[PDB]
Nucleic acid binder design. Structure first.
Lengths: 52, 177, 123, 136, 36, 470, 244, 386
RNA sequence: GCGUUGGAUUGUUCACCCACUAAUAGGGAGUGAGCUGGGUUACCCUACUGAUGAAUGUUACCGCAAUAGUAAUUGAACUUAGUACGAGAGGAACAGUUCAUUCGGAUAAUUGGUUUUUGCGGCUGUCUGAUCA
RNA sequence: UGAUUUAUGGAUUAACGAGAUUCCCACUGUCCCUAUCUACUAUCUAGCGAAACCACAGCCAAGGGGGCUUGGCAGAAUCAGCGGGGAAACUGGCUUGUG
């Protein structure tokens, strides 16, 4: 019974990678980047609360 | 088998081989013949020796040297035989001989406990009665509270102090009765 | 999730703390911690041992019986999930605990009234 | 495990080695069991084959009836008496340590059971759960 | 792969002089036979 | 051990067997010695080698023997047909040959070991070991042919069918190319070719079937010609010993048909030659492809022939054909009813089933012992809805299929909610809080609680207005 | 209407499921093919409910109920009790109960009208079952075979018990429990039919190893096809004596 | 001879030669490569371990035996004050490796990082970065020369951070530096994003979220010098082999008269770096939220910081990450928190997860009470309280 | 590349049985240092494992990575399937999903263990006039 | 060199012993399977202060029927543990699966 390293398993897992289980990741990282982008805007208005 | 093996399951094999030895011995043993058997000294050794004394006239255990002296190789001769035309079937089947003595889940009453030198070591649990007239007699004292209402339900959880308490209560109930 | 009362401690056993025991007579006994369990194994009497509620409630410290206590028994009659029902129950519990605190406080206050006159004669 | 033995097994605590006498809970007439072997083990250097709850074991009988004593037979563990862990959070154990007999396909030999049995054992095996009066 | 052990091609002198002494034995045996 | 034996794993030829065993010990065992080691090590090394090969040999020969079925007193059926078919003498001498072979190699093994225990030196032992192995090799070379004959019988016995002769069976014998293949096909999933040539079926063919909640086997014969009963080919001989051995009904597949164009005199004299072996056989003739002819137009000569057949005491004819199902079914029903009759007259003469069958036949009746009727509840809805159609373009979705289609079998999470009743489905998907600071809420939750806390508010009103809380 | 179907590869079905005339209960092991197998017969007529007990799957032997009432033992979580009352209609009464012994399916065989009970039961439970179900409750052992709820299957149509019961016990229990019954086998001689199979008045389920006589006799005694009121028994008396 | 039972050794060779690492900051060796169409995004973080606690959860695991049941499991908790960006390095490709060629800093710097770059601080004049800020403090353009250098060259970049350690309980008062790599394309976008992220904080919710599998790399838990039996799993010697007993008794003979490297002679254990991977996040709390520890079920107003506080660490007035498992590290140690180096596959990495209850009981002993309020109720009144 | 089990056993065990396991293959360099028979200065340096260290203007921070090392393994279940295949009897499969065994690395939330916190209690004898301590 | 013989039914042996052993019950960290705690040293420092032993001294593999030949490496100086070493096994390519 098979290894980790097996040719079968790895091509199978690779279609499984470019199938669903990268889709959630592409969603995840975009959500994350949106939050990251808007946190800079929170910090900007925090800066502008000192500017005023 | 080759001597020194395990002494439980080979005890089964020698025991059943010896039982077949009984079934052929009682078939074709002449009076004052010879019934000579090898045995692993087992838990059944007391049973077979007891019933051999119950069945036969001369039964000698040899305790031989010149074996390994690490296995329980015990060789026995049974000489003398009644040649019974009437046979006792209770002493061939190994069911009646296996009595198992106790020493000395259960939920019992308490008036019997008041009533009843080894008659104390079996009180495991009790049950509750509230309406009987003797309970109504026993109402008018310290009983029915301070863990007594629970210590009728279970007794394992007491320990020796409340054992002495419950025994003093049994003296109280006894002098009441 | 189910908080449990301790069999020996009469204390809350949260999930994953403390230990269950189960008898040949098919009785589960949860135990708050080592102390609770070891006393049970030692076959002690919590009705004798002081710091637990088993002793206290029976020895006439903090009130054992009240209408506030008869709200929180088991419910073996699991009705049907009204959200407004829970919206009421939560606030009800929030207030039940407050009045319980006050009832305990008054119990203690009438327990400990009468110190000052005996101190007055102590001097 | 074999035919009939349902499901998978979780990691539970391995309390009982070979050669720990335990009691028997069925109405065969067998009193006690003595393990000689465990099934489905691994192997590690001078480890003893360790038994647990929910395990099917090769084991002999010491006290009981003369017909069933002193021959090896399949047996299920039902009571550990050493602390194991549930996944819904609690640790637990029984008073005494106990196991029953059954055939290699997991089917019960007796017609009754005494005392409480393991939850995981009764879930993993149908027939102890069919013959179980008491669990937890 | 796992590239396995070789035999050498080194001289290992005992085998050289063993070869020479063996050779002379062979040629001696040939002369003992060669009269026939 | 029985029942179409397969555990006769393989036999090599002798040369390839020697190659097997010799290279096996050569590979597994050590293969290196220097002379400068000590002589116990050297002796014991060659001892190790010879005993290894010996155990390998005799274990292989044990795999031969314990695999092989030991025909003497296995079942008289299987035993005797094998004797007809597979050259009983050649069989037994082959097994004798390997038996003396294994005794020989064990003997020479023990004696050379007895020699080698005081083997002094290396050339001596090496010559000895090679010598012993050549001797066992030479006897293995003596035995090339019978082992290959046994390879073929291994193959054939693996191709043999599976029969319990004890059980309810229906022997089907007829002439060649009568429509038995059509018959067994129509009753049973077994596609034997129907093609009109003499030896089409060469061996014994099985089809299992069922009727009236029972299990039956049906054993069709390759077909028979006269070969008149003094000496005979093994095919008809095994058919004969099948008739002789199997205790179940026998069925004659008569062709009162235009096909099977051997003449009726040939057919009836064949029948007459097989008259004496119809002693206790429960013979049942059936005439085939009768819907084509409707044989009441038959002439008196062919009529008095079939009366010449019907002269025997026990005989019963049916009529059937191989274009509709009803007659083949009804004659099958009648044949297993003949088998019920046969099994009944076999079974009701022991009087032993009477003691234990009443426990199973005993359906109890209460006598209903009451005044109140207890009615089985069956709803209206079970009657209202349709039975589910497996194969339908439009049918109930069967959420197995939904889990498969989204989805998968062990990947998809069912929403356990949105399957049941609430006052409102919108907060079906809501979360229960289930917990408070202490004092878990499921032991609190009930109706009437606004009224109860209002009651408690009257109580605290009653205490605060008197000023109890000072 | 008898059907062969296998929980996941076990022929033992009433380990893992329960069936009333009015509802059905299933475990959550793996994939939704068992549920679907039952839903193919029943449709949306009554609820087939996925459930758990203590995070354990064994519902056909841990649980016991009828169309009038339903029980669970102590150890069920209150989330699951909520889930049950949300799953089921408010017609049926529901109760968690406190006992020495909890194996409800093992200990009770019952139908909508009447129940048999294990003898060492406690009296408060004996009271409560009769309160909740409104049924008549009877305390006996079957041929001395104990855990009667496991060694018996029952419905309003008929009865079934393991085959070793003597006829006097069969008769007296039939008169007691007020349906016909048979000492029988299921699933290649599996004496435990309470766990081996499951019945209501209008459906019967077994595992795949069950034979044609077995399904026939239980189809006869429980009369599953509308209508087979002892008619298929009266036909198939003969196969009983020929086979067994 | 061939020793008649062939068995595995006691230990792993791959983590050898076993030695104490150089610094408490776990250093990262490799990051997830890129998606150079996706926007910029950080690949790692810093955190500070504080304590472990317990969770129950409803596990949505198809196929399981714990599909839709309650399961308990153990978590740890890392402090995570948001993290401020100070500068960039540019990195190039050679056939020798990657090579730093330029670093640029962000023109206003805290005393915390100045406390790092000095080692004896209070005895300083604190003249760290002055002439660099003065090299900015003009029209500038030196900074821009370097930045465009990096835009032209410099395939890869990493960003320099430091923590806000002053916002913690913790007594170090010295800021930890790091280099963190990125996963966008568009090198000019990376660098200008940094140019605007200068002197700006970054929380973790901007990076991580629920149902994620990450990697922790840290340094571990000294024990000092340890004998072989405690260190490896080597057996103990029976009794009275002379010259010591918790040791390797016989290594061989005068053949071999030379010692091997694979037999676990004595030395250190601990203070090594390690990496432990595919640790599942369960929760990300935010310090501004009162009662981040209040789960979705419970609705008791309460924060995670348990009674008696954390042990050898204070209470949280910052964000937190809650991951299962046991992260390598000890109490009040740093960690460097990477993300997973590839697109994971396991359906375990997916569960829209429902934690049921966080424990906050006290870990200075056998905690039973989540809150002082519940304690105050259950106990009631005392001598002191009135 | 990884792995190769736990027990019982000698006036001539000889070659073994018992079971489990996926299996329970074979040999070298080994203890001429511990053990069994009817028995004829390991203190010098060496290498190894851990640990410091002047040197290159100094000191500190951040990193690269020449190289050397390398670890994962094994079995079972769910469907798939009672399908293919098979007269029957019997009955697999890679894709998907989940658990365990073994081995390793870390970890201390919880459970268990452990106590010189000799922390809080308890106890014998003696001593500090008795009590308290 | 020393329990007991002219039909006694002695000669068969009760008891006797820092003598030995089989089965069964009990017991326990011998073991699974190790974990922990204690006092001292070990360690460091102030002071006192040896001996054994010593051709030189030392890094490894193959070869030469510790040092030389050929190669691999070697970076000052050093500390603590360490127990592996410290002036009885190919005549001649031996041995292998096939009398």
């Amino acid at each position: 019974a098979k290894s980790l390293r097996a040719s079968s398993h790895l091509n199978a897992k690779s279609v499984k990678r470019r199938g669903v289980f990268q889709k959630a990741v592409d969603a995840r990282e975009q959500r994350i980047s949106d939050k990251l982008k808007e946190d800079l805007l929170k910090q900007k208005l925090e800066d502008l609360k000192k500017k005023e | 088998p080759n001597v020194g093996l395990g002494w439980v399951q080979d005890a089964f094999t020698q025991s059943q081989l010896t039982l077949q030895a009984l079934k052929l011995a009682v078939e074709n043993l002449v009076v004052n013949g010879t019934f000579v058997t090898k045995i692993f000294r087992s838990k059944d050794y007391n049973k077979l020796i007891w019933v051999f004394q119950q069945l036969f006239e001369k039964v000698e255990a040899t305790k031989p040297p010149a074996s390994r002296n690490v296995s329980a190789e015990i060789f026995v001769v049974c000489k003398g035989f009644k040649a019974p035309k009437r046979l006792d079937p209770r002493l061939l089947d190994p069911k009646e001989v296996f009595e198992e003595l106790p020493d000395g889940y259960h939920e019992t009453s308490i008036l019997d406990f008041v009533r009843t030198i080894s008659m104390l070591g079996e009180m495991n649990k009790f049950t509750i009665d509230e309406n009987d007239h003797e309970w109504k007699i026993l109402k008018k004292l310290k009983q029915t509270t301070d863990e007594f209402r629970s210590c009728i339900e279970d007794l394992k959880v007491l320990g020796k102090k409340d054992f002495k308490m419950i025994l003093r209560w049994r003296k109280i109930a006894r002098e009441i009765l | 999730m189910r908080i449990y009362q301790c069999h020996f401690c009469s204390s809350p056993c949260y999930p994953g703390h403390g230990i269950m025991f189960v008898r040949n007579d098919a009785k589960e006994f949860r135990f708050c911690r080592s102390k609770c369990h070891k006393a049970f194994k030692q076959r002690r009497n919590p009705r004798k041992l002081k710091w637990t509620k088993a002793f206290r409630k029976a020895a006439g410290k903090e009130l054992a019986v009240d209408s506030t206590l008869t709200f929180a028994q088991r419910r073996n009659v699991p009705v049907r999930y009204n959200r407004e029902l829970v919206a009421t129950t939560l606030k009800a519990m929030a207030r039940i605990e407050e009045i319980r605190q006050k009832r305990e406080r008054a119990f203690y206050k009438n327990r400990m009234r009468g110190n000052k006159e005996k101190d007055f004669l102590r001097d | 495990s074999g035919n009939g033995a349902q499901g998978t097994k979780f990691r539970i605590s391995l309390g009982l080695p070979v050669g720990a006498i335990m009691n028997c809970a069925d109405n065969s007439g067998a009193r006690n069991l003595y393990i000689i072997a465990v099934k489905g083990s691994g192997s590690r250097l001078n480890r003893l084959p360790a038994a647990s709850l929910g395990d099917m074991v090769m084991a002999t009988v010491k006290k009981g009836k003369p017909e069933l004593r002193k021959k090896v037979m399949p047996a299920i563990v039902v009571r550990q008496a050493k602390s194991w862990r549930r996944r819904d959070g609690v640790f637990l154990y029984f008073e005494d340590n106990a196991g029953v007999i059954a055939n290699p396909k997991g089917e019960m030999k007796g017609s009754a059971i005494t005392g409480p049995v393991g939850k995981e054992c009764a879930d993993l095996w149908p027939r102890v759960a069919s013959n179980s009066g008491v669990v937890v | 792969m796992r590239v396995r052990k070789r035999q050498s091609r080194r001289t290992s002198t005992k085998l050289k002089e063993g070869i020479k002494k063996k050779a002379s034995a062979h040629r001696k045996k040939e002369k003992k036979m060669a009269k026939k | 051990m029985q029942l179409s034996w397969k555990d006769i794993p393989t036999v090599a030829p002798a040369n390839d067997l020697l190659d097997i065993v010799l290279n096996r010990t050569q590979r597994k065992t050590p293969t290196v010695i220097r002379p400068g080691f000590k002589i116990t090590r050297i002796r014991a090394f060659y001892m190790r080698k010879v005993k290894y090969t010996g155990e390998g040999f005799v274990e292989k020969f044990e795999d031969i023997l314990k695999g092989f079925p030991n025909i003497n007193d296995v079942h008289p059926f299987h035993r005797d047909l094998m004797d007809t078919l597979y050259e009983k003498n050649h069989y037994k001498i082959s097994l004798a040959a390997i038996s003396r072979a294994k005794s020989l190699v064990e003997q020479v093994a023990r004696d050379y070991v007895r020699l080698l225990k005081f083997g002094q030196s290396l050339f001596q032992c090496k010559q000895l070991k090679r010598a012993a192995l050549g001797r066992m090799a030479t006897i293995v070379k003596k035995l090339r042919d019978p082992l290959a004959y046994l390879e073929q019988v291994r193959q054939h016995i693996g191709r043999l069918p599976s029969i319990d002769p004890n059980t309810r069976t229906l022997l089907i014998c007829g002439y060649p190319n009568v429509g038995k293949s059509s018959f067994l096909r129509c009753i049973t999933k077994s596609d034997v070719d129907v093609q009109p040539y003499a030896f089409t079926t060469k061996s014994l063919y099985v089809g299992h079937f069922d009727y009236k909640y029972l299990r039956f086997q049906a054993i069709d014969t390759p077909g028979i010609l006269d070969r008149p009963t003094e000496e005979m080919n093994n095919i008809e001989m095994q058919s004969i010993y099948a008739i002789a051995h199997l205790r179940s009904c026998v069925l004659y597949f008569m062709d009162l048909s235009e096909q099977c164009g051997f003449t009726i005199e040939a057919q009836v004299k064949l029948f007459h030659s097989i008259k004496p072996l119809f002693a206790n056989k429960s013979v049942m003739v059936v005439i085939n492809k009768t819907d084509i002819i409707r044989p009441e137009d038959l002439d008196e000569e062919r009529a008095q022939l079939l009366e010449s057949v019907k002269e025997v005491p026990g005989v019963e004819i049916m009529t059937s054909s191989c274009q509709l199902e009803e007659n083949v079914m009804e004659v099958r029903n009648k044949a297993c009813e003949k088998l019920l009759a046969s099994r009944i007259e076999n079974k009701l003469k022991s009087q032993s089933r009477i003691n234990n069958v009443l426990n199973k036949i005993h359906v109890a009746q209460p006598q209903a012992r009451d005044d109140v009727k207890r009615t089985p509840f069956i709803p209206e809805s079970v009657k209202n809805l349709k039975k589910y159609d497996p194969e339908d373009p439009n049918r109930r979705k069967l959420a197995r299929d939904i889990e498969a289609e989204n989805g998968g079998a062990g990947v998809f999470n069912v929403n356990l909610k949105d399957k049941y009743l609430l006052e409102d489905d919108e907060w079906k998907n809501d979360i229960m809080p289930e917990i408070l600071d202490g004092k878990n809420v499921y032991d609190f939750l009930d109706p009437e609680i606004a009224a109860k806390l209002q009651a408690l508010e009257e109580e605290e009103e009653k205490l605060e207005n008197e000023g109890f809380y000072n | 209407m008898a059907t062969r179907t296998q929980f996941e590869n076990s022929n033992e079905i009433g380990v893992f499921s329960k069936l009333t005339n009015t509802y059905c209960l299933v475990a959550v092991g793996g994939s939704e093919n068992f549920y679907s197998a039952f839903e193919a017969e029943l449709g949306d007529a009554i609820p087939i409910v996925h459930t758990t007990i203590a995070g354990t799957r064994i519902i056909g032997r841990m649980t016991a109920g009828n169309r009038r009432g339903l029980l669970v033992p102590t150890q069920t979580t209150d989330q699951e009790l909520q889930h049950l009352r949300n799953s089921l209609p408010d017609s049926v009464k529901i109760q968690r109960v406190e006992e020495r012994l909890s194996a409800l399916g093992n200990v009770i065989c019952c139908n909508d009208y009447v129940a048999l009970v294990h003898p060492d039961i406690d009296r408060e439970t004996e009271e409560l079952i009769s309160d909740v179900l409104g049924v008549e409750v009877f305390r006996q052992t079957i041929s001395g075979n104990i855990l009667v709820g496991s060694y018996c299957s029952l419905s309003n149509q008929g009865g079934l018990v393991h085959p070793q019961t003597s006829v006097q016990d069969q008769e007296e229990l039939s008169s007691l429990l007020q349906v016909p019954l048979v000492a029988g086998t299921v699933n290649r001689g599996s004496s435990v039919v309470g766990a081996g199979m499951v019945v209501n008045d209008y459906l019967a389920v077994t595992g795949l190893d069950t034979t044609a006589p077995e399904l026939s006799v239980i189809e006869s005694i429980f009369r599953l096809q509308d209508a087979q009121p002892e008619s298929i028994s009266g036909n198939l008396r003969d196969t009983l004596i020929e086979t067994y | 001879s061939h020793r008649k039972y062939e068995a595995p050794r006691h230990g792993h060779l791959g983590f050898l030669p076993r030695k104490r690492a150089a610094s408490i900051r776990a250093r990262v060796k490799a990051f997830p490569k890129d998606d150079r169409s996706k926007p910029v995004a950080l690949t790692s973080f810093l955190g500070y371990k504080a304590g472990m606690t317990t969770i129950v959860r409803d596990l949505d695991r198809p196929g399981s035996k714990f599909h839709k049941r309650e399961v308990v499991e153990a978590v740890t908790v890392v402090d995570t004050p948001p993290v401020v960006v100070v500068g960039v390095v540019g990195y190039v490709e050679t056939p020798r490796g990657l090579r730093s060629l330029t670093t640029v800093w962000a023109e206003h710097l805290s005393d915390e990082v100045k406390r790092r770059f000095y080692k004896n601080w209070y005895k300083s004049k604190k003249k760290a970065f002055t002439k660099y800020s003065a090299k900015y403090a003009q029209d500038g353009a030196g900074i821009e020369r370097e930045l465009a250098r990096i835009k032209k060259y410099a395939s890869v970049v990493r960003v320099l951070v430091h923590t806000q350690i002053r916002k913690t309980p913790l007594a170090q008062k010295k800021a930890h530096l790091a280099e963190i790599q990125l996963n966008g394309g568009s090198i000019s976008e990376k660098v200008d994003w940094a140019r605007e992220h200068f002197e700006k904080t970054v929380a973790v919710d901007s990076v991580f979220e629920q149902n994620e599998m990450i990697d922790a790399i840290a340094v571990t838990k000294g024990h000092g010098f340890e004998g072989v039996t405690h260190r490896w799993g080597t057996k103990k010697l029976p009794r009275k082999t002379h010259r010591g007993l918790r040791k390797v008794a016989c290594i061989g003979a005068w053949h071999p008269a030379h010692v091997m490297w694979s037999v676990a002679r004595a030395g250190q254990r601990g203070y090594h770096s390690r990496t432990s991977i595919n640790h599942k996040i369960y929760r990300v709390g935010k310090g501004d939220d009162e009662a981040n520890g209040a789960t979705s079920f419970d609705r008791t107003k309460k924060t995670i910081t348990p009674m008696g506080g954390f042990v050898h660490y204070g209470e949280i007035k910052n964000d937190f990450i809650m991951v299962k498992g046991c992260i390598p590290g000890n109490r009040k140690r740093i960690v460097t928190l990477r993300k997973s180096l590839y697109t994971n596959t396991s359906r375990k990495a997916l569960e829209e997860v429902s934690l049921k209850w966080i424990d906050t009981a006290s870990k200075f002993g056998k905690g039973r009470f989540q809150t002082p309020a519940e304690k105050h109720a259950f106990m009631g009144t005392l001598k002191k309280d009135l």
